[PDB]
Amino acid sequence: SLGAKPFGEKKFIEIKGRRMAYIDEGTGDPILFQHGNPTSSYLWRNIMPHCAGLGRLIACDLIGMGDSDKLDPSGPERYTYAEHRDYLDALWEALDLGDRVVLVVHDWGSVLGFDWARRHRERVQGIAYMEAVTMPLEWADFPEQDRDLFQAFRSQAGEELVLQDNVFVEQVLPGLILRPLSEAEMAAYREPFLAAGEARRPTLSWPRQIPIAGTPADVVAIARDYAGWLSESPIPKLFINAEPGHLTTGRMRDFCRTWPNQTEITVAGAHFIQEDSPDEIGAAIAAFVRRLRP
């Protein structure tokens, strides 16, 4: 069902001298849910219950997000993809995930998860993905109506929009969810970002890192690498397509539809589809995991 309550209990662990927060419920092989910008483990709260008893259910809060520590001193050079990956790699190592992991990914969680899967392919049992960065983008691949805003994030205007005015949390987020969010739901999304200034830096560093028209080159190369790999990998896949969808449409979707050994369903949603169709998404993930784990 829908609902504003988080799933399970937040746990904390020290990583590179910082505390990171995560949900870790149940036993067995992990089903690892990764949020992106500007969300947290909270994104998965109505989806994870569908996988009850099917494995160890894990959702990590990226550094500087959710209940994870902020980086200090924060600034325009902090919270790059590379820095997030250092923290998340270390957290995932610390969690003792074993060698039959099912990844469930979204948004920046997909860049992180697809890249981790490429690097740890022997340990990946299945990959479920939705509204994901399936390959590097060209501007034509970025949803037309949001181009100007994201171009502004990727300019000097970004600090005012995001650090001062919290545009990613307050405008982009509800703008890409089809149903109205409750007061409690927005409170949960707002909480890590209540203070103006550097507390909000992760939500600006993220759009600045999106691999678009060759920039930034490091993230482009990472996405190029995992795009080639996923297009050939026999690892079972679940593609949760969205209508109307947002990012994973057009050529982005044409491309991921070429990936081997893949099941697809379509659910209602734009970008943050977990808030529109959580039960349809959860049901599909659970069915996928049941087939992977007979």
Which of 90, 174, 265, 279 lies at the binding interface for Ca ion (CB under 5 A)?
174
CA atoms of 42 and 188, how far apart (whole Å): 8
Q: Quick one: what does residue 174 bind among Ca ion, Cl ion, none, with the CB cut-off 5 to 8 Å set by partner type?
A: Ca ion
Q: Are strands 237-244 and 262-269 parallel, antiparallel or unpaired?
A: parallel
Minimum gap (Å) between residue 229 Cβ and Cl ion: 23
131 an active-site residue?
yes
Q: Quick one: what does residue 206 bind among Ca ion, Cl ion, none, with the CB cut-off 5 to 8 Å set by partner type?
A: Cl ion
Choose the binding region for Ca ion from 9-17, 35-43, 175-183, 226-234 (rule: CB under 5 A): 175-183
Task: Give the residue with the Cβ less far from Ca ion, 143 or 174.
Answer: 174
271 an active-site residue?
yes
Choose the binding region for Cl ion from 35-43, 122-130, 179-187, 259-267 (rule: CB under 5 A): 35-43
Task: Give the residue with the Cβ less far from Cl ion, 193 or 206.
Answer: 206
The answer to the question of whether 192 is labelled as a binding residue is no
Task: Give the residue with the Cβ less far from Cl ion, 70 or 208.
Answer: 208
Q: Quick one: what does residue 177 bind among Cl ion, Ca ion, none, with the CB cut-off 5 to 8 Å set by partner type?
A: Ca ion
273 binds Ca ion (CB under 5 A): no
37 binds Cl ion (CB under 5 A): yes
206 binds Cl ion (CB under 5 A): yes
Catalytic option among 35, 84, 246, 271: 271
The answer to the question of whether 174 is labelled as a binding residue is yes
Q: What is the dihedral of CA 183, 188, 193, 199, to 10 degrees?
A: 170
254 an active-site residue?
no
Residues annotated in a binding site: 174, 177
> Site residues (CB under 5 A) for Ca ion?
174, 177
Catalytically active residues, by annotation? 107, 131, 271
Q: By the criterion CB under 5 A, which residues form the site for Cl ion?
A: 37, 206-207
Binding residues for Ca(2+): 174, 177
